[PDB]
UniProtKB/Swiss-Prot annotation:
The lineage of its organism: Eukaryota, Viridiplantae, Streptophyta, Embryophyta, Tracheophyta. GO terms for cellular component: apoplast. The record marks R162, A163 as: Cleavage. It comes from Arabidopsis thaliana. This is Metacaspase-9. The gene is AMC9. The keyword Secreted applies.
Length: 304
């Protein structure tokens, strides 16, 4: 008895200055895919989207809580399959760290995702697809399998960047605290307390030891699989078709690859084919893959 668990997050930030249009559609499309093709069950899928009528908003605390509940349920030797999809804004913190932007701006950074996957026992898998800017590297120190160190007219589509500049994020938070410091950690700790990211709540000395501790475990267990929408220094495109059916370019490329290839695919094959789709379609972003050598050759979501 193997578990198939999913957390699907989409942030459109609707009726705000940072609105996106395709992120919730990405969640709904991927939900239908894992239900039909990959054998996931409805009650094993948590959906967090920020449409105004939503019951559970994708705040930083709600996302981290849903991910923590999943990773704690994986059992050693079980082969449990855990899946996390994110569509929304991404940002980069200078001197670099990558982050996703929950709807309340309680940033979740690459060290938070490293701490999360370090809870997993050997034999289980955590597959993360992050259709967001600066998403390459979102699992700190996870080995790059496809990316700049290991591997056509521009699209005519209407596109919107899924990046929020760091200055925009810092200004939004400073508006809430009234503090004039440029240290984003100070704002996040004041606003979110223990729900703030690891980088911002721990003292400098304690963060160093935790980094060494997390580095130590990676030599024994490596269960994390990151499929990013773009490189660390890139953005990911939100696509407007022209009829009201927006989508993330990368999430849609994944759908196209899956539609053309019903058989089981290795993780590296899915990413390589998604890159080819986006390149052919004139998008500039380059999806990347971070995982162990063994998981690069493993089947995506352990499809039969």
């Amino acid at each position: 008895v193997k578990k198939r668990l999913a957390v699907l997050v989409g942030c459109n930030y609707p009726n705000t200055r940072n609105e996106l249009h395709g992120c919730i559609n990405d969640v709904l499309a991927m939900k239908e895919t894992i239900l039909s093709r990959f054998g996931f069950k409805q009650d094993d899928i948590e959906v967090l989207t920020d449409e105004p009528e939503s019951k559970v908003k994708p705040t930083g605390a709600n996302i981290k809580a849903a991910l923590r509940r999943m990773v704690d349920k994986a059992q050693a030797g079980s082969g449990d399959i855990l899946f996390f999809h994110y569509s929304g804004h991404g940002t980069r913190i200078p001197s670099q760290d990558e982050a996703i932007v929950p709807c309340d701006f309680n940033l979740i950074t690459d060290v938070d995702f490293r701490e999360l996957v370090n809870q997993l026992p050997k034999g289980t898998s955590f597959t993360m697809i992050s259709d967001s800017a600066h998403s390459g590297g979102l699992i700190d120190k996870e080995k790059e399998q496809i990316g700049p160190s290991s591997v056509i007219e521009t699209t005519n589509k209407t596109i919107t960047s899924r990046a929020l500049p760091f200055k925009a994020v810092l200004d939004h938070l400073s508006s809430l605290t009234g503090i004039t410091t440029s240290d984003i950690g100070t704002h996040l700790l004041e606003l979110f307390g223990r729900d703030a990211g690891l980088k911002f709540r721990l003292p400098a000395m304690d963060l160093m030891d935790l980094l060494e501790t997390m580095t130590a475990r990676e030599k024994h267990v490596d269960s994390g699989i990151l499929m990013s929408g773009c490189q660390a220094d890139e953005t990911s495109a939100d696509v407007g078709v022209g009829n009201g059916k927006a989508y993330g370019a990368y999430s849609n490329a994944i759908q196209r690859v899956l539609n053309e290839n019903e058989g089981a695919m290795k993780n590296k094959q899915l990413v390589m084919m998604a890159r080819d789709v986006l390149e052919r379609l004139g998008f500039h972003q380059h999806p990347c893959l971070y995982c162990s050598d063994q998981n690069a050759d493993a089947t995506f979501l352990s499809q039969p």
